[PDB]
Symmetry: C5
Subunit: 311 residues, 5 copies
C-alpha cells in the first residue's frame, strides 16, 4: 500500500493527539520517564471512500494491515513504543480516524540548578518522515490533547500537558521530517527534603557550634569531627539521588559551603587550644566569643547570597 | 467482525469479573503491584444464537478470531496486559461466556500518613470504549469476583477484593467510556517494625539520657553525639523504604521530633559544663535534675499528641 | 479441534511429569525462584488411533496445531511459562506422548522462623480446567518426575523433587479444575552466617563486657556505645537479606535480645560512675564484680531458652 | 519434515562449533554470564543431494522452514537462546552447513575458595534429543570452535575456549541425549583488590597495634575499637561482592582471623589497664613489650599457614 | 532471493551510514551504552533496474520480503538490534536505498587510567558476512553519517561521531567478513567530582594534620582515626562508581597514597606520645614542628609526581 495521492502539490496532513493515561517512573539520574497514553491520528485517504447504501454501514472499521497508515515515531524514546491499535474508522469522504494505546520510555533532560525547588518541562517528540511519492506534515488536533485526572508522578506536581501546534519541518538525509513537541510541565514537591535532609543537616551543624561555649579541646574535637562525618553521610545520600552535573545545584552549593564552616570551626578549636597551652587564654577567649556571633552571622548572610544567586 | 446490533437504542452490557490467583511485588516507593488473575466477560450476541435441537450441541466453543469480542482494557496499568484466552462458550440464546488469564503491573497510589500502621485500597480500573455502531457499558457479575485462599502479599494482610458495581460512564474524545473500580483492601503488618526500627531507636535515645546522671562533659558529648549518629542511620534506613511524600508520615514525625530531643540534650550538656567551669555547679545540678524528669515526660506527652493527630 | 470423546461418562486423564533441568534465582525477600524444566504430558485420543500394519509406521509425529492438546497451566507463576514443544508422538491405540521444555518464575512463600537454619518446601502447582464437552483430570507419571544431578541453588542444599500423586479437584468459576502439587524440598546452607554474622556479632558483644574490668567511665562509654553501633550495622545488614515477617525469626530474636544486653551494660556503667562520684566505690565494685558473671550467664541461659523455643 | 534416513543402523552425526563474539555480564553472586556467539551445525541429508552438472549450482541455499534441521538446545541456560539464522548451505553430496548467531544467559557455578586469586571454567552444554525415527549424536568441528580477539570480561583474563570432543551420550526419559561440553577458562584480575581492600585492611590492623606503645587506656580503647569498626566495614563490603558459600574463601579466612587479632588486642589493652590500676605496671609492661613482637609474628605465621592451606 | 550477480569478479559494495538520534545509559562498570539511530544502506541490484518512461514512476518502493537485502549485523552488541524498516527505494539503474531505525545495547571497553579527567572512544562495529555466490564489502557514505543536536549523555560531553572509512576485511570460518568502525568520542564532565569527592577528601586530610599543633594524644588519636574512617567512606564510594581495573586509576592512586599519609600521621602521633611519657618532650617537639612542613610539602610533591605520570 502506497500513500494517498495529492489533489495538487500540497503535502499530506496527519492530525495528531496524545491523551496521557498513566505517567510513571521518572528517573532523575537517567533523565527518563515512562508514559502510557492514547495516540490519535487522522488523515484523508480518498481510495477508501464509500457509499453507505451499498455498504450498509455509515462508517467502516479496517484492520491496520488493510489500509495505508503513516509511519509515526517518537524521536526521544529508548526503544520503539509498545502499541496496541484500539480503533480505525473511515468516513466515506475517506477521512481515517486512528486510535492506539501505547507505552514508551521517554528520554528528556532535567535542569537540577534549583534542586529540590526545581520545575521541569518533559518533552515527547512526535515525528513523520516524508516518502518519495508524497511529503507528510504533522498537525495538532487540540480536542484530542489532554491527560487523565488521576495522573500522578510520585514526588512531583503535574502542572500541564500541552502541544506546540506548529511543527518543526526540516530535512534529514535528503527527506522532509515533520516533528511535533508535546510538553509535560512538572514541579518538584520539595516538602520531604525539609524534615529529611535540610533540618537534620542544620541540627548537626548547630551542634558543632556548641564548641564555641567549651574550653575542652578533646570534647570540641569530638563535637566538630563527629558532626562533620554526619554531614559527609548526608552529602553521600544527596548525591545518590542526583546525577553528576557540569554545574552547581542549590543543595550541592549549601552542602559544599557547610564543609568550609566545619573546616574553619576545626581551625578555631585548634587556635583556641594552642593559645591556652601557650598561656594566652585571654586572646583565645576573644576569638571564641567572636566565633559565637561570626559563625551564625556568616552562615545566614552566605545563605542569603546563595538563595539570591540561585532564585 | 462488527458489534452485536441492538434490539432498541439500549447499550451493550458486558458483565465482568476478576478472580485473583497470584498477587505479588507491591513496590511502596513505586506505587506499583503485580497481579495474575482470571478476567471473565459475558455479553449477549443474538447473531450467535442457535437451536440446541437442530445443532445437537448445548454450547458452542469459538476461537477469539471467529467472533466479536469487546476491546477491554485496564486504565492504571504500566503496559498492556499479558493475556491468554482460556475459554469462549456460547449458550443457545447467544450469551457468550469469555475467560482469560492475565498478568499486569498495576499503578495505584498509597497513603503513607499512618506508616507503618497504614491500610490501603489498591485499585484495578477496567474500561471499555464505545464504538460508532453501538455504546458499550460494563457491569459486575459478583459470582465471578474473588481471590484464591493462598493469595499473599509479603508484609501485608489481604482484607478484601470487591468491585464497585456501578460504572463511571463518561465521555473521552467524544466517545462513551465505561469504567469499573475493583478494590483490593490491604493492611500493613507493622509487627517487624517494632523490634527492627522502633525499639532500637528508643534504646539509643534512652542511652543518650544517661548524660543527665553524669558530670563528665567528655563522656556526655560522646553519649549524645554517638546516639545521634545512630538515629541518623535509622532515619536514612527508614527513608530508603519510603517514597518522598508532600505530607508528614507518622514514623517521619517521630523520627524528626527525636532530633529536637538530641538538640536540647546537647544544649543541656553544654549549659551544665559552662556552669561547672564558671564555678556554678549548684545551678548546673538543678538543671540536670530537672532534665531527668523533663526529657521522658515531654517525650511521652509529645508522642501522645502525635498519636492523637495521626490516628 | 475439540477434546477426545469419552467411552463412558469417565473424565479424561492427562498424565503429567516434570523433570528439573535448571533451578536458579531463589529471591528470599520476593518468595520467587526461577525454573527450567521438561513438562511431559500423556493422554489417550481414540480419534488419533491407527493400525501399525496399514500405516507402516509404529508412531506418528504431529505438530501442536494438528491435534487436540490440553490447556495446562501453572497456578503459582508470575506470567505464563516460556514453552517450546520438543516432541508429540502418537501410539497405535491413540496414546499421545507430549514433551515441552519450559521456563517460569514461580511464587512460593517461605517460612523464616528458623533462619538461617531453615528448610523449605517450594511448590509448583500444575492445573487443567475442564471443558463443557468433558471433564479433565490430572495424574502423575512417577517415571517422568525427577531432576538433573547438576541442579544447584546457591546457598541451598536440594533435598528432593517429588509430586503429591492425588490431585486437588475443585470448582473455580463453575468448572472443574484439577490441580497437582510438585514439591521441591530445600535446606539452607547456614555455614557462611557463622564467620560472617554470628561470630563477629558475638565478638563485639564480648568486647563491650570488658567495661566490667574498667573503672574509667569515658573508656566504658566508648566501649559499650561503639560496639552497640557495630551491632546496629549487623542488624541492618541482616534485615536487608530478609523480608518483613509478622513473626519473630531465630536470628531476629537473638539480634533483638542483644540490644537489651547493651542497654543494661549502659545502665551498669552509669550506676558504677554515679556511685564512684558519690564516694561509694565499694558498692560500685560489688555491682561490677557481679556483672562479670551475671552478663555471660544470663546471655548463655537466654540463648538456651531461645534455641529451645525455636527448635 | 522427518529426519534423514540411515544407510545402516548408524546414528545421525551433527557436527557442531561455537565461535564467541561477545562475552559479558559475569555475575559472580548469580553464577550467570551472557554470551553472544556463532553456532555452526553440519550434517548429511542424502534426500537433499544433487548433481552439480544438472542443477547448474555448486551449493543450494535453503530457508530453515524448507528442510529438516536438528532441534539443538543448551542445557545450562536460563531461557531458550535468542537466535537468528545467518546461512544454510547444501553441498552436492547432501552435506548441510548451518550457521546462526545467538545470545543466551548461561548458568555455570563458580569456585570461590581461592578468591580473589581464583580461576574458573565456565561451561556451555550443547544437547540434542534423539527422535523415534533415528538417534542423533553430536560431534565437534574444531575448525569452527574459537573466540574473537576483542572478547573481554571486566575484571577477568580470558585464557581459552575449547570443547571436550567426546559427547556424553545418555538416556533421559527413555530417549538418547547427546551432550557436548564447551569450556571457557578464565582467571580473575586480583590487582585492584590489593590497593582497594587488602592494603587498607592491613593499614587499619597495624594502626590498632600502636596501642602496644601506649599506656593511655582511653586512647587504646579508641584505637582498637575504631579500627575494628573499619574492619567490619571491609568485611561487609567483601561479602556484598561474594555469594554465601558452604566453604571458607581465602579472603573470608583472612577477614575472619583478623577479628581474633582485634579480640586479643582488646584483652591485652584491658589486662594492661587492670594491672596499672592494681599498681602492677611492671607486669603490665612485660605483657605490652611481648605483644609488640607476638602480634606481628603470630599474624605473619598464621598467614603463611592460610596461604599454604589455600594454594 | 539470491544476491545480485557480479558484472565481473568484483565484490558487492554496500554503502552504509549511521545517524544517532538518541544516546543513553552509559554504564561505566558494565562498559555498555544504549543507542537509538538510523541505519542507512545502499547497493546496486541490476535485476531491480527499470525504465522510468515505461514504468511511469521515478523510484519503486519495495517491502523487505520482496527483494534481496544484505544481512548486516553489529559485532559488539549484547543481543540482535531492535530494528524497524522505514524505507526501501529503488532508482532506475537498480540502486537500492534502504533505511531502518534501530536500538541496540553496545559493548565498548573504557580506559579509566585518567578518571575522572578521562576521554573515551565508544565503538559501534558494523559487519557483513560474504555469501557463497558473492563477496560483500562495506563502505561509508559520509553524507549519511551524523548525530542529532539534542544528543546528550548525562555526565559526558559528546565530541564527535565519525566512521573509519576503510573496512577491516578478514576471514572468519572460511568466509570474508567486512567490518566498519563507527566512533563516538566523549569526554567526562569532571566538575561534580571536585565539590563532591576531591575537596571533601582534602578537607578531612588537612583536618588530620591539626594533630601536629596538639600535644593531647587522646585528641590526636580521635583526629587521625576519625578522618581515616571518613577517607575509607570516600574510597568505598569511589570504587562503587568504578569497575575493578588491572591498572591504577588517577583517583585510585591519590586515594591509595592518602592512606600512607594517615599511616605516617598515626606513627608521628604515637612517637610524640611515647617521647612525652619518657620525659623527652623537646625531641617530640622537633618531630612535630618538622611534620607541620614535611606533611603538606611531601603531599604537594607526590601529587605533582602523580599528575605528571598520569597526564
Ligand atoms: C593565627 C592562626 C591561623 C591559622 C589558619 C590556618 C589556615 C589553613 C589554610 C588551609 C588552606 C587549604 C594543614 C592543616 C593545618 C591546620 C592549621 C593549624 C592551626 C594552628 C593554630 C596555631 C596558633 C598559633
Ligand atoms: C539553609 C536552608 C536554605 C533553604 C532555602 C529556602 C528555599 C528557597 O528559597 O527556595 C526558593 C523556592 C522557589 O520556589 P519557586 O516558585 O520556584 O521560586 C521561583 C521564583 N522566581 C521565578 C522569582 C525566581 O521557594 C520555596 O519553595 C519556598 C518554601 C521553602 C522554604 C524552606 C525553608 C527551610
Ligand atoms: C541559658 C542558655 C540557653 C541556650 C539556648 C540555646 C538556643 C539555641 C537556639 C537554636 C535555634 C535553631 C548555634 C548553637 C549554639 C548552642 C547553644 C550553646 C549554649 C551555651 C550555654 C551557656 C550557658 C550560659
Ligand atoms: C514511640 C513509639 C510510638 C508507637 C506508637 C504506637 C502505634 C500506634 O498508636 O498506632 C496506632 C495503630 C493503628 O491501628 P488502627 O486500627 O489502624 O487505628 C485506627 C483507629 N481509628 C480508626 C480510630 C483512627 O495501632 C496499633 O497498631 C496498635 C499496636 C502497636 C503498638 C506498638 C508500640 C511500640
Ligand atoms: C539502682 C539504679 C537502677 C537504674 C535502673 C534504670 C531503669 C531504666 C528503665 C528504662 C525502661 C525503658 C531514661 C534513661 C535513664 C537511664 C537510667 C540512669 C540510671 C542512673 C543510676 C544512678 C545510680 C544512683
Ligand atoms: C549465640 C549463637 C547461637 C547459635 C545457635 C546454634 C544453631 C542452632 O541451634 O540451630 C539448630 C540447627 C537446626 O538444625 P535442624 O536439623 O533443622 O534442627 C531440627 C531439629 N528438630 C526437628 C528436633 C526440631 O542446628 C544446626 O544447624 C547445628 C549447627 C550450627 C551451630 C552454629 C553455632 C555457632
Ligand atoms: C590473665 C587474664 C586473661 C584474660 C583472658 C580472657 C579470656 C576470654 C575468653 C573468651 C572466649 C570466647 C567476656 C569478655 C571478658 C573479657 C576479658 C577481660 C580480661 C580482664 C583482665 C584482668 C586482668 C587480671
Ligand atoms: C595478608 C595478605 C595476604 C596476601 C596473600 C598473597 C596472595 C597469594 O599468595 O595468592 C596466591 C596467588 C595464586 O596464584 P595461582 O597461580 O593461582 O597459584 C596456584 C599455585 N599452585 C598450583 C601451586 C597451587 O598468587 C598470586 O596471585 C601472587 C601475587 C599476589 C600478591 C599479593 C600480596 C599483597
Ligand atoms: C623511631 C621510631 C620509628 C617507628 C617506625 C615504625 C615503622 C612501621 C613500619 C610498618 C611497615 C608495614 C605494627 C605497627 C607498629 C607501629 C609503630 C609504633 C612506633 C612506636 C614509636 C616509639 C618511639 C621510640
Ligand atoms: C589533589 C587533587 C588533584 C587534582 C588534580 C587536577 C586535575 C588534573 O591535573 O587533571 C588533568 C586534566 C586533564 O585534561 P586533559 O585535556 O585530558 O589533559 C591532557 C593533556 N595532555 C595531552 C598533555 C596529556 O585537566 C583538567 O581537567 C584541569 C582542571 C581540573 C582541576 C581540578 C582541581 C581540583
Ligand atoms: Cl515510537
Ligand atoms: Cl490492558
Ligand atoms: Cl503456565
Ligand atoms: Cl537454547
Ligand atoms: Cl545486530
Ligand atoms: Cl585474513
Ligand atoms: Cl569469501
Ligand atoms: Na498499513
Ligand atoms: Na474478535
Ligand atoms: Na492444538
Ligand atoms: Na571518644
Ligand atoms: Na525445518
Ligand atoms: Na529480502
Amino acid at each position: 500500500v502506497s500513500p494517498p495521492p495529492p489533489i495538487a502539490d500540497e503535502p499530506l496532513t496527519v492530525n495528531t493527539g496524545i491523551y496521557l493515561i498513566e505517567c510513571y517512573s521518572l528517573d532523575d539520574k537517567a533523565a527518563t520517564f515512562k508514559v502510557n497514553a492514547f495516540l490519535s491520528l487522522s488523515w484523508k485517504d480518498r481510495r477508501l471512500a464509500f457509499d453507505p447504501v451499498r455498504s450498509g454501514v455509515r462508517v467502516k472499521t479496517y484492520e491496520p494491515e488493510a489500509i495505508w497508515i503513516p509511519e509515526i515515531r517518537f524521536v526521544n524514546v529508548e526503544n520503539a513504543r509498545d502499541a496496541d491499535v484500539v480503533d480505525i474508522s473511515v468516513s466515506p469522504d475517506g477521512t481515517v480516524q486512528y486510535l492506539e494505546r501505547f507505552s514508551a520510555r521517554v528520554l528528556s533532560p532535567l535542569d537540577f540548578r534549583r534542586y529540590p525547588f526545581d520545575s521541569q518541562t518533559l518533552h515527547i517528540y512526535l515525528i513523520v518522515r516524508s516518502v518519495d511519492t508524497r511529503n507528510i506534515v504533522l498537525a495538532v488536533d487540540l480536542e484530542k490533547v489532554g491527560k487523565n485526572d488521576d495522573v500522578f508522578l510520585t514526588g512531583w506536581d503535574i502542572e500541564s500537558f500541552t502541544a506546540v501546534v506548529k511543527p518543526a519541518n526540516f530535512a534529514l538525509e535528503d527527506r522532509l521530517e515533520s516533528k511535533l513537541d508535546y510538553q509535560l510541565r512538572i514541579s518538584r514537591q520539595y516538602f520531604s527534603y525539609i524534615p529529611n535532609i535540610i533540618l537534620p543537616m542544620l541540627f548537626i551543624l548547630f551542634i558543632s557550634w556548641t564548641a564555641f561555649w567549651s574550653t575542652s579541646y578533646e570534647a570540641n574535637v569530638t563535637l566538630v569531627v563527629s558532626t562533620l562525618i554526619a554531614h559527609i553521610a548526608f552529602n553521600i545520600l544527596v548525591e545518590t539521588n542526583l546525577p553528576k552535573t557540569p554545574y552547581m545545584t542549590y543543595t550541592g552549593a549549601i552542602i559544599f559551603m557547610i564543609y568550609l564552616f566545619y573546616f574553619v570551626a576545626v581551625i578555631e578549636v585548634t587556635v583556641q587550644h594552642y593559645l591556652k597551652v601557650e598561656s594566652q587564654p585571654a586572646r583565645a577567649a576573644s576569638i571564641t566569643r567572636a566565633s559565637r556571633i561570626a559563625f551564625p552571622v556568616v552562615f545566614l548572610l552566605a545563605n542569603i547570597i546563595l538563595a539570591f544567586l540561585f532564585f
